[PDB]
Structures are given as C-alpha cells and as structure tokens.
Design a binder for this molecule. Structure first.
Ligand code: ANP
Ligand code: ARG
Lengths: 362, 361
C-alpha cells in the first residue's frame, strides 16, 4: 500500500462517484470508506486496489474485484450489500451449498432440432494464494505448474495437451483461435485497472483434450477457467465429463501439492469477480426459438424459470441459468434442461399458431 | 505489496526477459533481483511496481518508472547503470548542472516559413508526495490544489484559469488535444503498465493563460508539466516566458505551503521516467522539412546535432536529444542552432543545390 495515504484524511481519498452506475458507488459511503481505507488483508491487499476497477470505469456494474479470499471478510461492509443486490437477495447470514453430483442431473435429451450446442463453464481458484488482481509472479507460475501437471495426468477421453501462452508461435496461435480456445493480450480496462494484466503472458496458459470438448484457461481472471462443450442437446453428458475432469484435477493437485480449491461455507467457490460466486457455473444452450423472440413474455417467462436469454449468431438464443449464488450446480443445470424443454414446447405451439397462455406464469 | 511474495525463492519471482530490448532486461540480474525484491521504499513502493512497465512491454527501451524520490536511491543498483547507458555515460559520480538563465539563449528567430511553432516544456514534482505510478487520490488532489492556486496568482499576460478534466466535456478535450495544448488521455501501454492511469480523470487538469502560450498539465506523467509555446520561431522568447512562470509558480507554492520541487545535486530535477532527469526539458519546433525527409542522412544528421526527430506532409517535431548532464540553456540553444542548419539545408534542396558542405563534421 502507499504509506503516505494514511497521513491524509479519508475524506480527501474518497472517490467522486458522479456519473457512476455501479453497486460500488451505491453502497460505499464516505463513512464506510473512512473506516476501511487503511485496513488491509493479511496478504496486503488494499481497499483502493479492491475498488480500482470501478473508480476507473463508472459504467461497470459491480466495479469490485477481490485479490484474495480474506477480501470478502475484511471488506464485508462493502461486499455483502453488493453481493446481496447482484445475487438477488443473498444475505451475509445465508450460506451456499455445493452439489456437483452428475448422477442427479436430468437425462432428458433436448430436441436436436432446436438445440445446437450445450455448455458448462465454471471458474476455480487455489486456496491460500492470491487472486489475479494481487498475485505475484512466483505464485502464478506455481499455479500454472500444479494445474498443468494435473491436466497432463488426465487420460482416456480427458487426455490432452497443454499450451503455454509464452513464446507461442503464430501457427499454434492460429490453430487455437480457429478452435476458439485462445485468449490473449488483456487490453480491456477491466483487466488493466484491475491489475490482472500484469506480467502477461507469464504464467498464462490453455489446455484442451484431444476430443476438444474439455477446455481449461489458466491464470486469466481466475486461476482456472473450466469449460465443457459439445454439439447437440445432451447436457447431462456435458456435465458428467465436466465433473469428472474437475474431480480428477483437484485430486491430483490435492495429493501432489497438498492444496485444493478456494472455498468456504457462506460463498461456495471464491472467484475474483463477485458476480461468479457460489457455483460460478454458467450452463448454456444455443436454442432456436424464433417464434418466442416475437412474443413479449419471452423475457418474463425466462426470469421465472430462473433463466436469462441472449441473442446470438436467425432466432437463435443462448439460454443460461440466472442463478450463481444461493442454489447448486445440480439445480442450475436441471434448471436449464427443464426450462429449455418448456421453451421448445411453447415454440411448437406458436409454430402451429396455437396459444401458450396455458403455459406461461400467472 | 504482496506479503506472500517474500515466502518464495527470488528466482521463481524473477522476470523472464526473453526477447526484451530494454535497459531493464539488460541490467536487472537474477542476483540483483534477489537482493532487491523485498526491499521497499519508505512510501511502500516495490521493485516489482517499478519494473512493471518494462516487464509488460518488451518493446520498450527503458522499462522503469519511479514511485517516489527514494526510488532512485533504494534501487540505485538498477537505476544508476540504466541512467548511465541511457544518458550517454552519466555516472552516479557525475553531477547535473542547472541554468535557467534566459539572457543566454540564442536570440536568433527561426524562419517562420519553415518553423510552424516553438515549444519548451519541463516536468516538476513536489517533494514529499509520491509520483504518478504510486500516488493516491488525496495526495493527487493536494497537488492539484497547491498548483492551480499558484497559477491563478499569475497576472497580466500570465493570467488564466484551471480546467478540471472532470468539468470539461469530450469536445473541449478533443479540441485541446488536436490543437497541441492538452495531453493524450492515458490509454497507452506505458501509462497502464506503470500504474499511472489510476483514478483518471480524478485530479488531472490543464491550466492556461487566456493567451495560451503558457500552460501546465496537472498530474499526468509528472505532478506538473510546465509549457511555453507560440506560433513562429522566436525560441528565446518562448524560453523567457517559460522561466518566468516557472520561477513565480515555485515562489507561490513555497510561500503558501512551504513545499518545493524534488531536486538533488546528482540528478537535477527528479522526474518519474528516468528518461527525463536533469532538466526534464524538451525544446521542440514543428518544422516543414519535406526535402530533408527524402534524404537518407536525415536521422544521422539530427543525431549528430544532438536532435531527435519524430514525424506524424514532411512535417517534423525536432527536439533536443539530451536531458541529463547539460543545462537548459545548452539544450534550447542546441535546438535553435540545429534547426537553423536544417532550415538552411532545406532551402538548398528546394533549389536542387548541395548540402554536403553543410553536414556537421
Ligand atoms: N514545437 C511544438 N509546437 C507545437 N506543438 C508541439 C510542439 N512540440 C510538441 N507539441 C505538441 O505537444 C503535445 C505533446 O507532445 P509530446 O510528444 O508528448 O511531447 P512532450 O509534451 O514533451 N511529452 P513526451 O511525450 O513525454 O515527450 C502534442 O499534442 C504535440 O502536438
Ligand atoms: N516518458 C517517456 N515516455 N519516455 C520514453 C520511454 C518510456 C517507455 N515506457 C520506456 O520505458 O521505454
């Protein structure tokens, strides 16, 4: 931290939130700031570094980025009310539940005629080590180290290859971009003022299995970004490979280094940006619902089935789980499955020209 | 600082300088990095913070930024050798000399047909406050306050007002930049890898007299950037107005807050980027030299007359190469003298005449 800072009145350090449209600006008052300005985490992460994201960008919705797990407890006065509003009422007294049991997932195969692709993405961080806003070079290398080794120990259908973003050649860069596996130069301001673009690309890397349905990004926003994806609508299979890979990797790391995933009872998995807390899961499917798009209640139909839609490229929508924190991976995934099946059924009624007032919420 | 960093062996924290072309990758050895990785300045600035600019950008030539004044001494092991190669053999034993004497400036008026505008700028930092890569908001506002007030005390032709970058709209700002008065908005990799773009635009602004031949940038790369500029080639006059506002702005700050500019005997004025030590002066003109641009000797000839050229119509910015080890009067005079030869050569080439005998030897 800057040691001259504390000789000054907090008042003089308090951000001007004029024009800002973030939850940071809405909940951090002058008195709350005067209270935590000189209070840092055990690893040395400050309040300023924590809010740098939003002070620098007034239109970012949250404008908050944690540098370690203790950031959520040391700066609870700011994080809790922000987590509560974003996560639709999740309180500081509420506790998150994890349920990564693949056998609990519905075996309903969504209509291949309406569903193009199925996807499951989550993020994981390593316990006891600084997140990206704050991570040093040695910690980052060590993460890359224990994670790539665990991915490289994967076998059978999880068997694959690791790629260091460092000194990568154009041939390999072109390949990964053609597959949509590659992530590069963190030029975006979310990363730059977030302190996450440091030392790039030292410590960064990507990994994908030979069958190309299991993808892992290394040391981007979170220590690991895990994605499982394939064509069609067999979400259940997508989630079962997703869960198997996660289990085998944590187990390799846990036994070879002694460490596991950043995780606690109140928040579930700890992620850098609080918008991905709890499950950090994004279960999505590309569905073809053109007649739904013209229907006005499409938005509300989804919100009540706890889902969000996103247009993508005619009439193709990305339908994902609305919840992250407060409900489980199992519930969020079966939420998408049941929801999409209901969406396909209403879609067929509109194709025929029938009414679906018999299916929508009251 | 990351308190968990000292727990790891220094080698695992040591930068992979593979492919870097900077002075940082050339002088920061593994053993040096090991000895200075956990040594922080009195204000808390770290070695990592200081070298971030070059670690992130291997194309950069220097790679290091100072967080405060103690940075230059606490990390002298890195900065001295770097300062020495960059500033042509300037050792830590050598000492910088100041000379802001306006009466000693060459009174030649550069041909206005070729010299569009003349400019003189320098950087000043207030002692006791962190520099831009480390400065917090309260310090930045305090600086913004003590400088803007020192400037509104100026009278007559130096008389002007302060414009906060928070108060001015995008169109006034784009205008000021296209017209060469206001600084670029900090989105270059240099500003973002060094921690200098934090809280922007809180604490920054541009102050200028109603005339606009005298202005100063507040809290960009350096606490202040004092500028003197006008149309034409009367450099001695640009410099005169420059040393006046400079003197007066410094008297006011002292009288009102008792603060002064960072300056020691070895380095002269202390600036954030070590490329700007000594005088912190960039004496420049925007000259019309389309015939010189076609000559492959252009660069060699500039370098010879100790000048740097950076283009964009054959329009070039011609400034002094040297900063540290020689004075303000010497640098400005070096530019007046050199741009003069450049103008003469240009008049030859226009006539299809020789300039071979004009080439410095
Ligand atoms: N002789 C000149 N006449 C008019 N404008 C100039 C002159 N020299 C530089 N400028 C303008 O000043 C602005 C800043 O120039 P820049 O290249 O940043 O030089 P500087 O102010 O010394 N900063 P730096 O980039 O650190 O060297 C630009 O918009 C230029 O158009
Ligand atoms: N103030 C400046 N931009 N000086 C020029 C060199 C800066 C550049 N970031 C480097 O370290 O190479």
């Amino acid at each position: 931290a800057n040691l001259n800072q504390k000789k000054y009145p907090a008042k003089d350090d308090f951000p001007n939130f004029e024009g800002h449209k973030s939850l940071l600006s809405k909940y951090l008052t002058a008195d709350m700031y005067a209270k935590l300005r000189d209070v840092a985490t055990p690893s040395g992460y400050t309040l300023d570094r924590a809010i740098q994201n939003g002070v620098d960008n007034p239109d970012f919705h949250l404008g908050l980025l944690a540098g370690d797990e203790e950031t959520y407890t040391v700066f609870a006065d700011l994080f809790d009310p922000v987590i509560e509003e974003y996560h639709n009422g999740f309180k500081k007294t509420d506790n998150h539940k994890t349920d990564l049991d693949a056998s609990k997932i519905l075996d309903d195969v969504l209509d291949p005629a309406y569903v193009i692709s199925s996807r499951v993405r989550t993020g994981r961080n390593i316990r006891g080590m600084a997140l990206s806003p704050h991570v040093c070079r040695s910690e980052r290398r060590a993460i890359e180290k224990m994670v790539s080794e665990a991915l490289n120990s994967l076998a059978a259908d999880l068997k694959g290859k690791y790629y260091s973003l460092m000194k990568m050649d154009e041939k390999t860069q072109q390949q990964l971009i053609d597959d949509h596996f590659l992530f590069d130069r963190p030029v975006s301001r979310h990363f730059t003022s977030g302190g996450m673009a440091r030392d790039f690309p030292d410590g960064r890397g990507i990994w994908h299995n030979d069958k190309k349905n299991f993808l892992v990004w290394i040391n981007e926003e979170d220590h690991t970004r895990i994605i499982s994806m394939q064509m069609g609508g067999n979400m259940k299979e997508v989630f079962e490979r997703f869960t198997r890979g996660l289990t085998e990797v944590e187990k390799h790391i846990k036994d070879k280094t002694g460490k596991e995933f950043m995780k606690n009872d109140h928040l579930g998995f700890v992620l850098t940006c609080p918008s991905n807390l709890g499950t950090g899961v994004r279960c999505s499917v590309h569905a073809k619902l053109p007649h739904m798009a013209k229907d006005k209640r499409f938005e509300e139909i989804c919100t009540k089935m706890r889902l969000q839609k996103r247009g993508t490229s005619g009439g193709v929508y990305d339908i994902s789980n609305l919840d992250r924190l407060g409900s489980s991976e199992v519930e969020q995934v079966n939420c998408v499955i049941k929801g999409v099946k209901v969406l396909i059924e209403m879609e067929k009624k509109l194709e025929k020209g029938e009414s679906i007032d018999d299916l929508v919420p009251k």
